[PDB]
Structure 1
Amino acid sequence: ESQPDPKPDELHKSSKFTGLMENMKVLYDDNHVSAINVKSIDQFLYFDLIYSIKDTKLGNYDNVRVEFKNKDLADKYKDKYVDVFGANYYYQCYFSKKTNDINSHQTDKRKTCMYGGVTEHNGNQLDKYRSITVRVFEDGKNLLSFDVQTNKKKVTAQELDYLTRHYLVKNKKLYEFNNSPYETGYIKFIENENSFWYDMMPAPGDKFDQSKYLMMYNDNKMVDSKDVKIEVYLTTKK
């Protein structure tokens, strides 16, 4: 089944967001969580899992809390080896680790947080990368198309959304420090006779809540990388 295209729920307008657009841009910039074949090492609340994933590139985190929509999802992946991929946040992130009074001077642990992004490792690997075409519509016209790549058979929508928006930040300035050249944007995922979409712009007002925005990924929704198609619909600002 297909989510109706926007107009019920009309889209967020970037011109009515008066906060710092950088706080959206940073979620789809170069840095993101990516780990292959890792297992949970702890749990804070009953609907999350904690991973020791080090930020080898900048060391901004050593531990990542992954939050899910419900207990069933955390139970499904607990203690199993998985791949993790997603957009992380810091300012609103908190968790405690249950290391049983720990030792070895745990100290100086650097934390970050995310939602969903988890797929089983075993069985889900392709030998060679798969390409997925993204068609971009600007004011109704398809003026740009490009591909994103994944090595997973079942892939989260979060991973594909990140890769799509990363290209558009770098090449079409989708988000800038204090504005966007686009008024509205949505990303649409098509998988056989199912389709769904996400609003790409922040809610109006002077503050952007990163955690609430990223919470949409807590369903861990997945698509089959061989069947999915991506469309992006942007409208330009006056």
Structure 2
Amino acid sequence: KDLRKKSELQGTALGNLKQIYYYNEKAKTENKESHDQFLQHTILFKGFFTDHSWYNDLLVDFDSKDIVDKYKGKKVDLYGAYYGYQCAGGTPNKTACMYGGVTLHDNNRLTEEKKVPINLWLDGKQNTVPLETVKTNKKNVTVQELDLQARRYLQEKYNLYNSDVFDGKVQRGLIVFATSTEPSVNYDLFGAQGQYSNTLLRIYRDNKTINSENMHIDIYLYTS
């Protein structure tokens, strides 16, 4: 183990994790481009939202200027969670923020949707997870795209981020994105930093991307 316990999470942090992974809508677009920037580790997509009530622009945060350079001016696809609190950079009051979630558009379409096999163990006992739970059309997919989908299932099925009072029985948990061609990426399900979206989502700022072709996800949940 030696993972964070949900009881170590404070007041609003648990509620906001449920907000992010269960209630909020996700930014999901194909074929966008921009060379606009706010700070040098960001890329500003002016007019990203066309139907949104409150928002207009999307400011994407990356780990460094080096990562920005790989996407700036190129045609890209986006899939990620965004927040409006403590966000600014474009149109005043109508700017939404996101960490990573950007992949190159050209030659990344798979002929058919790839269904990512999920292996799940609740207190050692294996549980069957439907194959259409986590899926993608990208050859190189951000871990964020996959994580958002997996955690929603965990919410629906296990009330992952509900307080104990509300049948939230899982206390510790881990998600592992196992690829055959590189080392695993694994997140502690209760290891987010802070209480708000602006800090809880920083885990995706590295824009970690993985080959979806022949990989799987392992999820280990514990009720104590």
Q: Could you tell me the TM-score, scaled by structure 1's length?
A: 0.82
Instruction: Map 1:108-127 to 2 at 5 A.
Output: 110-127=94-111
Q: In 2 relative to 1, CA 92–109 (structure 1 residues): closer, same or farther, beyond 3 Å? A: closer
Query: 1:154–1:222: 8 Å Cα contact kept in structure 2?
Result: yes
Query: Which AA in structure 2 matches 1:32?
Result: K
Q: What are the Cα deviations for residues 119-143 of structure 1, in whole angstroms up to 9, with x where unaligned? A: 1111101122111011111111111
Aligned position for 1:186 = 174
User: Given the two structures, how large is their TM-score scaled by the length of structure 2?
Assistant: 0.87
1:138 correspondence with 2:133: no
In the alignment, is residue 23 of structure 1 matched against residue 10 of structure 2?
A: no
8 A Cα contact 2:17 2:200, kept in partner? no
| 1:135–1:146 CA contact under 8 A, matched in 2 | no
Runs of 5+ consecutive residues of structure 2 not aligned to the other structure: none
Could you tell me which residue of structure 1 aligns to residue 73 of structure 2?
79
RMSD: 2.2
Q: Distance in 2 between matches of 1:45 and 1:203?
A: 24
Runs of 4+ residues deviating >4 angstroms: none
Higher relative contact order (CA 8 A, sep 6+): 1
- How many correspondences in the alignment? 216
For residue 14 of structure 1, the aligned residue among 6, 27, 31 is 6
Q: CA deviation at 1:161?
A: 0.5
**Percentage identity across aligned positions?**
36
Equivalent AA in structure 2 for residue 24 of structure 1: L
**Where in structure 1 are there 5+ consecutive unaligned residues?**
1-5, 98-105
Letter in 2 for 1:17: L
Q: Deviations over 1:133-167 (max 9, x none)?
A: 11111111111323311000110111000111112
Larger helix share, 1 or 2: 2
Question: How does 1:42-81 map onto structure 2 within 5 Å?
Answer: 42-51=36-45, 52-54=47-49, 56=51, 59-81=53-75
* 2:76–2:104 contact (8 Å) kept in structure 1: yes
Inter-partner Cα distance in structure 2 for 1:68 and 1:19: 28
Task: Determine if the alignment matches structure 1 residue 170 to structure 2 residue 160.
Answer: no
Check if 1:197 corresponds to 2:191. Answer: no
